[PDB]
mmCIF file of C-alpha atoms in Angstrom:
data_model
loop_
_atom_site.group_PDB
_atom_site.id
_atom_site.type_symbol
_atom_site.label_atom_id
_atom_site.label_comp_id
_atom_site.label_asym_id
_atom_site.label_seq_id
_atom_site.Cartn_x
_atom_site.Cartn_y
_atom_site.Cartn_z
ATOM 1 C CA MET J 12 0.000 0.000 0.000
ATOM 2 C CA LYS J 13 1.150 3.556 -0.770
ATOM 3 C CA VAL J 14 1.162 6.665 1.407
ATOM 4 C CA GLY J 15 -1.903 8.729 0.614
ATOM 5 C CA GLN J 16 -4.904 10.501 2.054
ATOM 6 C CA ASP J 17 -6.610 9.008 5.134
ATOM 7 C CA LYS J 18 -3.786 6.460 5.565
ATOM 8 C CA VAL J 19 -2.219 6.007 8.984
ATOM 9 C CA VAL J 20 1.511 6.059 8.246
ATOM 10 C CA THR J 21 4.184 5.014 10.709
ATOM 11 C CA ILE J 22 7.788 5.952 9.893
ATOM 12 C CA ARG J 23 11.233 5.995 11.477
ATOM 13 C CA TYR J 24 13.258 9.179 11.146
ATOM 14 C CA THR J 25 16.426 10.991 12.110
ATOM 15 C CA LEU J 26 16.686 14.769 11.777
ATOM 16 C CA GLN J 27 19.743 16.693 10.591
ATOM 17 C CA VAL J 28 19.950 20.438 11.218
ATOM 18 C CA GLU J 29 23.196 22.156 10.153
ATOM 19 C CA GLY J 30 24.844 18.768 9.617
ATOM 20 C CA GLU J 31 24.280 17.909 13.294
ATOM 21 C CA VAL J 32 21.810 15.257 14.460
ATOM 22 C CA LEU J 33 19.229 16.618 16.896
ATOM 23 C CA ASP J 34 16.655 13.836 17.272
ATOM 24 C CA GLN J 35 15.840 10.364 15.982
ATOM 25 C CA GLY J 36 12.698 8.372 16.598
ATOM 26 C CA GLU J 37 9.583 6.661 15.326
ATOM 27 C CA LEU J 38 6.041 7.957 14.974
ATOM 28 C CA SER J 39 2.699 7.366 13.273
ATOM 29 C CA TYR J 40 0.464 10.106 11.890
ATOM 30 C CA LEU J 41 -2.805 10.350 10.000
ATOM 31 C CA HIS J 42 -1.854 11.433 6.488
ATOM 32 C CA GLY J 43 -3.659 14.404 4.982
ATOM 33 C CA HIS J 44 -5.150 15.994 8.109
ATOM 34 C CA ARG J 45 -2.412 18.588 8.808
ATOM 35 C CA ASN J 46 -0.696 16.481 11.471
ATOM 36 C CA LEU J 47 2.769 16.478 9.856
ATOM 37 C CA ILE J 48 4.821 19.413 8.637
ATOM 38 C CA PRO J 49 3.883 20.264 5.020
ATOM 39 C CA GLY J 50 7.263 19.503 3.437
ATOM 40 C CA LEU J 51 7.545 16.073 5.034
ATOM 41 C CA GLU J 52 3.969 15.241 4.018
ATOM 42 C CA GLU J 53 4.627 16.254 0.405
ATOM 43 C CA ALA J 54 7.793 14.138 0.510
ATOM 44 C CA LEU J 55 6.000 11.037 1.809
ATOM 45 C CA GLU J 56 3.088 11.267 -0.651
ATOM 46 C CA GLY J 57 3.067 8.298 -3.013
ATOM 47 C CA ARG J 58 5.773 6.373 -1.153
ATOM 48 C CA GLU J 59 5.349 2.642 -0.553
ATOM 49 C CA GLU J 60 6.090 0.518 2.531
ATOM 50 C CA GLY J 61 9.798 -0.212 2.893
ATOM 51 C CA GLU J 62 11.066 2.809 0.958
ATOM 52 C CA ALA J 63 13.752 5.076 2.390
ATOM 53 C CA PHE J 64 14.950 8.512 1.329
ATOM 54 C CA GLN J 65 16.540 11.783 2.349
ATOM 55 C CA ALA J 66 14.335 14.866 2.405
ATOM 56 C CA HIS J 67 15.221 18.558 2.659
ATOM 57 C CA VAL J 68 12.432 20.660 4.174
ATOM 58 C CA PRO J 69 12.929 24.450 4.225
ATOM 59 C CA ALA J 70 11.689 26.456 7.186
ATOM 60 C CA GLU J 71 8.677 27.746 5.243
ATOM 61 C CA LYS J 72 7.488 24.148 4.785
ATOM 62 C CA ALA J 73 8.402 23.157 8.365
ATOM 63 C CA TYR J 74 7.593 25.146 11.530
ATOM 64 C CA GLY J 75 7.924 28.495 9.768
ATOM 65 C CA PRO J 76 10.270 31.446 10.144
ATOM 66 C CA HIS J 77 11.439 33.073 13.362
ATOM 67 C CA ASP J 78 9.218 35.992 14.381
ATOM 68 C CA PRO J 79 11.106 38.809 16.159
ATOM 69 C CA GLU J 80 7.909 39.978 17.864
ATOM 70 C CA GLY J 81 7.755 36.467 19.386
ATOM 71 C CA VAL J 82 10.240 37.619 22.040
ATOM 72 C CA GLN J 83 9.210 39.696 25.050
ATOM 73 C CA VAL J 84 9.766 39.972 28.804
ATOM 74 C CA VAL J 85 7.432 38.722 31.554
ATOM 75 C CA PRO J 86 8.142 39.263 35.282
ATOM 76 C CA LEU J 87 9.167 36.281 37.389
ATOM 77 C CA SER J 88 6.038 36.999 39.464
ATOM 78 C CA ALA J 89 4.141 34.970 36.848
ATOM 79 C CA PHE J 90 6.153 31.822 37.233
ATOM 80 C CA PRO J 91 5.347 29.102 39.774
ATOM 81 C CA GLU J 92 7.319 29.853 42.944
ATOM 82 C CA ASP J 93 8.051 26.125 43.156
ATOM 83 C CA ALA J 94 9.342 26.088 39.569
ATOM 84 C CA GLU J 95 12.751 27.292 38.417
ATOM 85 C CA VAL J 96 13.350 29.631 35.488
ATOM 86 C CA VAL J 97 16.532 28.505 33.742
ATOM 87 C CA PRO J 98 17.569 28.985 30.086
ATOM 88 C CA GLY J 99 16.089 26.029 28.211
ATOM 89 C CA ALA J 100 13.117 25.315 30.472
ATOM 90 C CA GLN J 101 9.675 25.367 28.875
ATOM 91 C CA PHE J 102 6.376 26.568 30.329
ATOM 92 C CA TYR J 103 2.843 27.298 29.177
ATOM 93 C CA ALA J 104 1.158 30.690 29.098
ATOM 94 C CA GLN J 105 -2.462 31.530 28.288
ATOM 95 C CA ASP J 106 -3.931 33.707 25.504
ATOM 96 C CA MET J 107 -6.793 36.192 25.941
ATOM 97 C CA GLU J 108 -9.097 33.404 24.696
ATOM 98 C CA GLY J 109 -7.419 31.231 27.366
ATOM 99 C CA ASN J 110 -6.025 28.837 24.771
ATOM 100 C CA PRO J 111 -2.492 27.834 25.770
ATOM 101 C CA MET J 112 0.760 29.430 24.433
ATOM 102 C CA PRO J 113 4.000 27.441 24.800
ATOM 103 C CA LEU J 114 7.228 29.278 25.541
ATOM 104 C CA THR J 115 10.942 28.675 26.071
ATOM 105 C CA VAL J 116 12.832 30.936 28.473
ATOM 106 C CA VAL J 117 15.977 32.288 26.830
ATOM 107 C CA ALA J 118 17.492 34.241 29.719
ATOM 108 C CA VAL J 119 16.770 35.419 33.287
ATOM 109 C CA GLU J 120 17.937 38.897 34.326
ATOM 110 C CA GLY J 121 16.659 39.202 37.870
ATOM 111 C CA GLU J 122 13.029 40.223 37.992
ATOM 112 C CA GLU J 123 12.923 40.154 34.170
ATOM 113 C CA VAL J 124 12.686 36.860 32.234
ATOM 114 C CA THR J 125 13.135 36.721 28.453
ATOM 115 C CA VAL J 126 11.100 34.121 26.600
ATOM 116 C CA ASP J 127 10.510 32.940 22.995
ATOM 117 C CA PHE J 128 7.069 31.890 21.805
ATOM 118 C CA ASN J 129 8.435 30.712 18.453
ATOM 119 C CA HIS J 130 8.815 27.051 17.655
ATOM 120 C CA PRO J 131 12.326 25.880 18.643
ATOM 121 C CA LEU J 132 13.020 25.036 14.968
ATOM 122 C CA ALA J 133 11.767 28.309 13.485
ATOM 123 C CA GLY J 134 13.959 29.690 10.725
ATOM 124 C CA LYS J 135 15.771 26.337 10.681
ATOM 125 C CA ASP J 136 15.910 24.147 7.599
ATOM 126 C CA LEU J 137 15.447 20.427 8.199
ATOM 127 C CA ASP J 138 17.173 17.328 6.817
ATOM 128 C CA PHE J 139 15.475 13.951 7.262
ATOM 129 C CA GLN J 140 16.620 10.382 6.723
ATOM 130 C CA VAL J 141 13.241 8.637 6.664
ATOM 131 C CA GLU J 142 12.090 5.064 6.083
ATOM 132 C CA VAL J 143 8.396 4.197 5.845
ATOM 133 C CA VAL J 144 7.828 1.264 8.182
ATOM 134 C CA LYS J 145 4.091 0.826 7.636
ATOM 135 C CA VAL J 146 1.025 2.181 5.859
ATOM 136 C CA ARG J 147 -2.531 1.168 6.729
ATOM 137 C CA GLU J 148 -5.996 2.522 6.103
ATOM 138 C CA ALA J 149 -7.370 4.555 8.985
ATOM 139 C CA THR J 150 -10.141 3.408 11.217
ATOM 140 C CA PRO J 151 -13.443 5.333 11.433
ATOM 141 C CA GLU J 152 -12.685 6.585 14.961
ATOM 142 C CA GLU J 153 -9.299 7.944 13.879
ATOM 143 C CA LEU J 154 -11.014 9.820 11.050
ATOM 144 C CA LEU J 155 -13.632 11.146 13.484
ATOM 145 C CA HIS J 156 -10.910 12.460 15.799
ATOM 146 C CA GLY J 157 -8.516 13.624 13.081
ATOM 147 C CA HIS J 158 -5.539 11.963 14.686
ATOM 148 C CA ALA J 159 -4.112 8.421 14.742
ATOM 149 C CA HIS J 160 -4.901 6.341 17.828
ATOM 150 C CA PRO J 161 -1.549 5.897 19.592
ATOM 151 C CA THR P 25 2.482 37.662 21.480
ATOM 152 C CA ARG P 26 0.881 39.589 24.410
ATOM 153 C CA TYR P 27 0.006 37.360 27.403
ATOM 154 C CA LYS P 28 -2.957 37.227 29.792
ATOM 155 C CA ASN P 29 -1.709 38.438 33.197
ATOM 156 C CA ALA P 30 -1.772 34.827 34.451
ATOM 157 C CA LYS P 31 0.618 32.292 36.021
ATOM 158 C CA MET P 32 2.728 30.202 33.653
ATOM 159 C CA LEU P 33 2.591 26.409 34.189
ATOM 160 C CA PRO P 34 5.463 23.998 33.473
ATOM 161 C CA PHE P 35 5.617 21.261 30.871
ATOM 162 C CA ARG M 21 -0.238 33.331 14.677
ATOM 163 C CA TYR M 22 2.438 30.616 14.579
ATOM 164 C CA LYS M 23 0.605 28.383 12.134
ATOM 165 C CA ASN M 24 2.695 25.188 12.122
ATOM 166 C CA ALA M 25 3.272 25.247 15.873
ATOM 167 C CA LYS M 26 1.840 21.930 17.076
ATOM 168 C CA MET M 27 2.506 19.685 14.072
ATOM 169 C CA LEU M 28 4.523 16.485 14.238
ATOM 170 C CA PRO M 29 7.338 15.240 14.224
ATOM 171 C CA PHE M 30 8.231 17.738 16.974
ATOM 172 C CA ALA M 31 5.083 19.407 18.288
ATOM 173 C CA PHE M 32 5.471 22.419 20.580
ATOM 174 C CA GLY M 33 2.979 22.115 23.417
ATOM 175 C CA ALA M 34 -0.180 20.167 24.094
#
């Protein structure tokens, strides 16, 4: 079977950014429901079980560019007193709607904490070594929820 | 962008 | 705002 719309696709991957390896793993996604980054989805379209390939995904097709207005300062008064602000730690904030907003603290300067709301891989081009381990047709419940079961 | 004046929560 | 934010392989948040 070939990778296409409404197919649950599981694949192994390893990600190269700037010639360095940053993660490697295995995951399954529902194809065609905006669950994978566009470039990777376009790359996997039409592939058949067992295939393997390299794929270059520019930032536009993967997690987008870095927004400079995605960086601002929030007082430490807003962080959990129990929790520690340290460059690299990640917390959640809330929008006016109350929907969550992830963040990564970049630096702490006393009362002032500098944080980035951008995706950690914004403005970063991606290199993938990917093999397609399995394709299957999705189940009704997965289609009703828009995501693959596991 | 701008944040609700509310406590952050860890991952 | 950040359109692709929560997409796999590496989703940011939950």
